[PDB]
Every structure is written in structure tokens, then in C-alpha cells.
């Protein structure tokens, strides 16, 4: 039912869409990079505030916040999410769709507000079974809780 | 030829073999993940004679 | 049958090949880098709709999708792939000619969309057998599952 949609800092014109739901939510084209001017645009939060608007305005309720690194896509506890892809532009390290489903402990996003929860499952390295680990904003740690129902 | 329970696990006889099952879980006779072999896999131990 | 060329994102003037079935398909040259239009041309996904046009017109059926990070050749029910390379034009890191036999779990392709396989085998580190590992679209994670056949 929720989502997230790290941010990470543009490098100069690249696509980043954000399918929710099947539909093409929230495009934008990072500038060419030759006016000066246009370094502004590779901030990671200005650019996560414009993916918030493009999201707030191409979906119907959906509250969406924009973190320190992340945009918290919410379901309006009706729908849920059902398809959640990110076509980065540049490689996997630009923009990030992570969930409640992360496969290691170091691919783990850094903010994740204070209420999240991750399923760790396998990595398939060592004989384990499979924990979930809980984020916590006054102290920014990962702690292990438990299970959801 | 035989059902027994030997530590945890449901065990079969055959013709020369003896199966035993996972350590938990009685009606399972594989183990979780062929990827790290992890103490608690089914065994198969033929009786040498 | 089946097979994925991830894309990654161009670096100023290389050559991108991707050989199916022995021919020589699918060609592009990223440009000279002069002009400050030509950083649109290193974007991934541009470059993948644009391999993947190529792959469309230089295959018969060969149903090929442009995902997130990667194109996926397919052959149509009848003949195979039968021969997999891919000039990449830079060093290795650029664009991966992946299939279902990646040798680590390290080396696993991103996405690789949601019914796909990969026989992990070896790495020859540790005495192991080798075990098959599928990717899941909705919880983006790679948990292990049987056999083909």
C-alpha cells in the first residue's frame, strides 16, 4: 500500500518516470547542461519536490511527502499500488523504487520515515531465514521487529 | 516398509535405504535450498553391509 | 529462448552491437559529445527504445520489450537464439548481454521482468551446488525456485 521513490541527484539530462498503477506518472527531462544555470536542477531535493507535484497532480488522493531523500507514495486505503516500476535514465544508482521487500541489508534506503517496515529476504549467501527490520528517526538505526498481521 | 520417528524427524524404511525426513516439518523430504546445505536437510543413508 | 541486453547509458561516442542468431543487428554510435544536445543521446532508456527499434526491424517476429534497465529478445515458438554477443563499445560495464546462467549472485541483471530465471552456478569459492533463483515484479527481490524441467 505504500511506496517509495529515493532520490539521488540527476547528472544532466535523463528521463525519470515513476509508473504507479499502470499509468505514466510524473515524467521529467534533467536540462542538457550547457547554461550554467541548469546545475540548480540536479539538486535531489528539487527534484523530489517536482516529482511530488507532477505526483500530487497525475493522481486523485494519494498523499505523497517529500523526506530528506525519498517520496512516500500512500495509498488513500481503498486501491493499492499493483505495479511500481522507475525507468532511471542513467543506471540503477540515480533514482531508486524501493518497498517493503529490500533483498540484503546494505541495499536498504538511507531515510525511510519513521513508520516502515523491510522484509529481508535471502541474498542466497548464507543459510538464513528471513527477518524484518524496522527504522526509527529519532535514532537513526535499523532494528529488527516483527512480523506485520 | 515401516514408518519411525528418529529425533524430529518421520523416517522411512526401503529396500536398502533409510530416508529421514526435515526436522521441523514431518511431510518433507527435500531440503529448503540446495544453496547453503543448512543442518536440518533430509538424509539419505543407504546401509552399506 | 529468452534473453536480456541491459542498457546502462552511452559515455560519448562507442559502438553498440547486439548479435542475434549470427547477424549483425541492431547497430547505433552514441555521438562525438561536440554539441551540448548530444547528452540527451546517453540517456539509457532513449538508448534502449532506440536498440529495440533496431531489434524490430531487423528480426522477423522476435517480440522484444523495452522494460526498465533492460530489452528483452524473444524468439517466436520456433527457432532459438543460438548465438548471444554484444559488442559493447566501452569496457564490459556499459551494456550486458545477461541470460539465464549468470555465474555469482553478484552478477544478476536489475530487473529482468518478472517471469525469469537464472541457473546461479559456481563461482568456485565455495563448494556449492548450483541453484536456480527467480525475480518477482511486485517485491523487487530474488528468491530461489525449482528446475525448468
Known sequence: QDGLINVRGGQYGRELIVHINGKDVAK???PDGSQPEHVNNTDAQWLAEELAKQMR???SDWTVNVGQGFIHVTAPSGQQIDSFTTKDG???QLINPVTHYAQSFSKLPPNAPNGYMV???GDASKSADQYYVRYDAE???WTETLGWN | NDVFFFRNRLGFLSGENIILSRTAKYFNFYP???ANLSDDDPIDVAVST
Chains 1, 3 share one sequence.
Do not use: E, F, G, P
Request: charged share 30%; aromatic share 12%; glycine share 0%.
Open chain 1, 28 to 30: 521529467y527531462k534533467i
Open chain 1, 57 to 59: 497532480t497525475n493522481l
Open chain 1, 90 to 92: 542513467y543506471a540503477d
Open chain 1, 119 to 121: 522484509k529481508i529476504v
Open chain 1, 139 to 141: 535514532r537513526k538505526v
Open chain 2, 32 to 34: 529448503a535450498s540446495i
